[PDB]
Design a protein around this nucleic acid. Sequence first.
RNA 1: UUCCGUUAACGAACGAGACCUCAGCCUGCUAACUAGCUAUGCGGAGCCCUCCGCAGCUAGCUUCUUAGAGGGACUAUC
RNA 2: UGUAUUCAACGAGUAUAUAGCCUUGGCCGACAGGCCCGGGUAAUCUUGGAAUUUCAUCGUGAUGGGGAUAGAUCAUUGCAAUUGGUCUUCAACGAGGAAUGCCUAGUAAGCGCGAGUCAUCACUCGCGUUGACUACGUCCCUGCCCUUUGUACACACCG
Lengths: 119, 271, 178, 61
Amino acid sequence: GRVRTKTVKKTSRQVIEKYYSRMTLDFHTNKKVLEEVSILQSKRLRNKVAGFTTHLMRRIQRGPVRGISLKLQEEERERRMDFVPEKSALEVDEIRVDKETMDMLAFLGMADLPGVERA
Amino acid sequence: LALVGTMRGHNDVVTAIAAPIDNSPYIVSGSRDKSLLVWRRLTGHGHFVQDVVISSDGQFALSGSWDGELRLWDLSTGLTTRRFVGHTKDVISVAFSVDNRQIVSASRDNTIKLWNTLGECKYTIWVSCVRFSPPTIVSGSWDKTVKVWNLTNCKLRSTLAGHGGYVNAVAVSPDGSLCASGGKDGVTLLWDLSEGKRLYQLEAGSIIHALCFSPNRYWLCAATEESVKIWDLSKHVVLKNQMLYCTSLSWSADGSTLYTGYTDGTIRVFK
Amino acid sequence: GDVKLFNRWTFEDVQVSDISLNDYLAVTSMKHYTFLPHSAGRYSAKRFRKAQCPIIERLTNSLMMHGRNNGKKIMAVRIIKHTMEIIHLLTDANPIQIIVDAIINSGPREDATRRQAVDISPLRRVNQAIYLLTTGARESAFRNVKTIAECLADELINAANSYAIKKKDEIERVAKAN
Amino acid sequence: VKLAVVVKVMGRTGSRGQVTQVRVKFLDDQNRLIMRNVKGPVREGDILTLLESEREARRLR
RNA sequence: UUCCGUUAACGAACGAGACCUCAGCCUGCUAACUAGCUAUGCGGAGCCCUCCGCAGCUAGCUUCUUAGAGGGACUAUC
RNA sequence: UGUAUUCAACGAGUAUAUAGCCUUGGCCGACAGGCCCGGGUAAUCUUGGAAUUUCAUCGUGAUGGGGAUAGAUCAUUGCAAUUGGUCUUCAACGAGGAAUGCCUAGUAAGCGCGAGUCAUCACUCGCGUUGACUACGUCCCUGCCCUUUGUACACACCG
Ligand SMILES: [K+]
Ligand SMILES: [K+]
Ligand SMILES: [Mg+2]
Ligand SMILES: [Mg+2]
Ligand SMILES: [Mg+2]
Ligand SMILES: [Mg+2]
Ligand SMILES: [Mg+2]
Ligand SMILES: [Mg+2]
Ligand SMILES: [Mg+2]
């Protein structure tokens, strides 16, 4: 039916992977770019590829997908290294110690640690 | 800026709105509906027309279709005064000359072409929309650069490479002393034609279809996808189917109104 | 209005005395009422498309039987015109009204299949009524002095005592016994 | 003679799939919802006549 | 066995799809005396107008037929 | 049945011997058939290309539906009798038991045309015309495919 052959799926994925810079949302722009950035013999295969690429741009304009890569957030790197607070999330005081852990710190550990609590 | 009215006489995207210099009420809209309109209908092409203009006398209409050809039309009779054929790739834009006797066209063939309105001498030099200087010619390129030519010998004058995105069109001052670009970067670059150097930047946000300079207000109206933005030359914006994008902006000769070419034919006038 | 059947019949007089068979009959005098029941339109493409087709088209298309009569819609509409003139001249009323009355009084309500009894679709109701009327006219016309128009007219008025009503009677009797 | 409007269609049922089981409500009393079966073509929003309004049905007959 | 995914499998060959022919749309192009359309001129009948036939080595055109390059549809929008 | 309107496509068509093919036109012949003028080795010439549709005699009768079958007769094809013209003859046949086959849209069904067959004689392959009912669901039957399962089958349940 209207499901897409692995060839058109693959070629759409590759053209988006290497040519996401300029390609736009309109189907006709997609096909007029495809005709010169790649060699496709059947015109209707080219039309199928262009429409599929348009559909995946609709998919990607909302969020990332599992198909493409390069510039690995969608177009720009440095997504999670910026999530470094000026203070570490791990606290050191009154740090979550219970009765049995108190018995542990009475064992080989030091019972006078800075983060010991009576909880 | 307020709503004047709405139009619904079009079934596809209207790409160019052209108005006579004489301010006469005979404007021509060239659309990718395979049809034109006059505010008379034109259908002599067989593909999707992109760029339309109006002669200096205001009694002719020049429009180019995506089949790869151009046609200058007798507005009254609705017939072609002349054709222009030889753009193998689809044409993208048209413009007249300083004397409105030569026609400059930009297509998908990575080249620009100058044609005589009556003469048989034609010369050639993805080039986006072009607009001649009212005498250099400015043009958009396929590498985020804007080229300026020389009309004396059809030679390249200079290149302006400061744009982070592609250039979809060009803007020139009404007196032929400014240059402006725009694209996906959303930052419109303004330069001076004389020195060909980067003057300054304006921030919009996304693609601007048409950049129109106010003939009297010395302003700049840009059809940004997020919101149409108008600057005064203080560099400050002192205008608003789940997808909503304009296609062209046109400054009226009077200066108190403006006309927009939209997607679903809703041509809107502001005043 | 400016649209009349053969420039003779006015559609803005005929109603339906039921709220279950309205949309399946194109008798409303706002649209779907035509000059004659002959049109080269496609109605078998999608489901429920023939509901938009005029009733007179259905009646004239169901007469092209048996195999010696199909492809002769011209005779069909000529005969329907003749029987229409007969009905109007006799009854002194709008023949559209008589056609609608006959159809609305010739549709069976329940059948029995699988044997359990259960209802009938309204589109199937009008279709069965038209088929029954055409077959009854054919039965009354075969090997008889009568022409097609005369038996069609008699069956149309008698169904507004008749073949179609007795066929519906026996079908409903078989249905209601299970 | 209790006219009913088809409210939802429960897929074709029967040996040949000729009967189609639907849920209906009465035009005289909207709030009463029954299940019945209908031959022929039936779509939602239609109005259907009957004779006996007391017969019940089953889901996916 | 078309695809997305799941995945002790990974990467591939056929088949399918892809392909080719014809038809369906083009008042867009190419150009037609072994194909046509219109006007005019002449002759035919009841100046004009209704009207049939014949020429005008270009009256003009390819809308009507022919045949070629092309376009159009890709499920894009709701 | 008899008058009178009239709308298609596909293809095919010469050895020029007078002339083997397509045949135009004129003449003769009720028709079947014959002579003359000739064209086309082809978009040129054939190629100017039926059911249906106004009108009427039938009149429900195995009747002008039907024409099986026969006799008399003329001519064409062929070396040598196949077919076609005229009249006369006018059988069964008044929707067909069990069973049974095709088909979802310009399709089925109805009507012709061309080609193959060919010295002469039309079923098959295409062409066009008129043109609908229902369905647009299902695995009930007849099958096909996949998964699980059972097997004493493996020529494989006609085991
Ligand atoms: K004349
Ligand atoms: K006989
Ligand atoms: Mg033509
Ligand atoms: Mg196409
Ligand atoms: Mg007759
Ligand atoms: Mg014809
Ligand atoms: Mg008889
Ligand atoms: Mg007989
Ligand atoms: Mg044989």
